[PDB]
Structure formats: C-alpha cells, structure tokens
Amino acid sequence: ADNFVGLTWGETSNNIQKSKSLNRNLNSPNLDKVIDNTGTWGIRAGQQFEQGRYYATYENISDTSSGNKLRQQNLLGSYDAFLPIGDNNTKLFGGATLGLVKLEQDGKGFKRDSDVGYAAGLQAGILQELSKNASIEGGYRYLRTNASTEMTPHGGNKLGSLDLHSSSQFYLGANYKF
C-alpha cells in the first residue's frame, strides 16, 4: 500500500471536424499553448494497495472562451488493480468507479435541479513511471449517469442483443505518490 496523488485529464470528443474563422486574414490574437473546447480536468489523490489502487478525481467544469454559466462540483472514487505490463514501465490497471455530481441552475424560488446524480462505470489503462519523482497515467475512462427507475414505461421486445448505454472517455495525466 502507498499514498498516491496527482492530476486527471479526460479527453471527450465525439465529433471530428475542422473550421476556420475569417478568410481575408486580419485578426491574429496571441494565444499559443493551450487552446481547447471540450475536456474534463481535475485532481487525483487516494491510497494504493498491494493488490489494488484507490484514487478519487475532483472536477468542476471544462473551461472555455464562450463558457456561459459555469459552476458545479464533481467527486468520484475509482478503485482498480494495476500490474507490470511488458517489462517495468507501464502499469496495466483496471477497475470500477463511483461518485456524485452536483448541478445547479438559475431558478430562484422553485429549484428544478436535484443536485444529486449517481455516477459509476469502469476504468483501465497503463501507468508509466520514470523514476522516484512522478509517474504518468494513460488509458480509458467509463462512467454512467443518474438512471434510477423510469417515468413512462414503453415496453417493446427482446430482439437479439446489444451493448448497454455507456459513455466513452479517455484517460491521461500524472500520479505522484507519497
């Protein structure tokens, strides 16, 4: 067992297209180092084990240039088991996670948002270490949203089979143990 603390970065991009503003070329700002639009960024900190590893991820909301009304909380605890994969650099980890996301909106008086959502899914990747300084995490991240009971039961038929409803997320960041 060993204490672990770092950062988490999830890549979320379903659509893949390219665009360009203004063709005449006249305005050219001064921003070249960090330009994105979608992506979850947070911190990491938990407790490692001889047969597993724990680490929670705290987030809020992806920053942007046209970000309007942004303010919430995100807490999730993922528990997976890592193991040397290949030689002694990457760390094939895999497990599940569970947390709670709070969402608030402008209403005043009558609150619509419940501010309570059940989150849970799966995770797995490979932790690349360099030395006794800091490690690196990189893999995939799966999480579910609040889905308890249904409102209007439709009902149909069980034709063959299909994959459940899950989200596709990436995993990339660092991990500093204590």
Side-chain angles (χ1 to χ4, degrees):
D2 253 55
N3 270 48
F4 259 81
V5 292
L7 270 139
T8 34
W9 232 321
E11 223 272 65
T12 169
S13 53
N14 59 89
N15 61 309
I16 311 300
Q17 285 274 96
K18 223 174 77 137
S19 72
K20 268 215 142 204
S21 327
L22 266 297
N23 221 86
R24 300 305 196 80
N25 271 229
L26 282 111
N27 215 94
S28 208
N30 297 83
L31 310 152
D32 309 317
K33 51 127 162 187
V34 290
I35 311 115
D36 65 326
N37 201 350
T38 29
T40 61
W41 58 277
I43 51 142
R44 223 214 244 198
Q47 306 280 117
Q48 188 258 62
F49 260 59
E50 228 76 87
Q51 65 133 63
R53 66 168 297 90
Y54 232 118
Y55 56 95
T57 303
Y58 184 102
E59 299 164 18
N60 288 39
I61 185 107
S62 326
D63 202 275
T64 336
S65 267
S66 32
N68 51 64
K69 298 260 176 144
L70 318 153
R71 212 209 71 193
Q72 45 183 247
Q73 221 200 54
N74 200 322
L75 208 291
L76 277 134
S78 52
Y79 57 103
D80 41 278
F82 69 87
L83 227 141
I85 184 79
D87 223 298
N88 225 74
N89 38 295
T90 30
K91 229 83 153 112
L92 193 96
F93 60 81
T97 179
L98 59 139
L100 55 97
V101 297
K102 236 180 172 136
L103 248 81
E104 269 190 31
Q105 222 167 309
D106 188 52
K108 283 275 81 142
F110 257 68
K111 287 220 135 310
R112 230 180 313 161
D113 268 325
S114 51
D115 263 310
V116 62
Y118 206 72
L122 278 141
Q123 295 193 41
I126 48 180
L127 219 97
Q128 286 148 100
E129 64 204 283
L130 265 133
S131 220
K132 264 120 258 293
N133 247 128
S135 257
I136 311 164
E137 61 126 311
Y140 283 117
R141 191 255 239 79
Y142 310 114
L143 261 150
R144 210 231 198 79
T145 39
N146 62 87
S148 207
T149 319
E150 251 178 86
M151 232 213 64
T152 58
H154 222 318
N157 246 285
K158 209 215 174 75
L159 303 111
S161 218
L162 42 84
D163 216 36
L164 44 57
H165 221 167
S166 216
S167 257
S168 325
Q169 245 96 288
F170 289 76
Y171 225 43
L172 57 144
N175 280 267
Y176 180 57
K177 61 219 186 117
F178 254 85

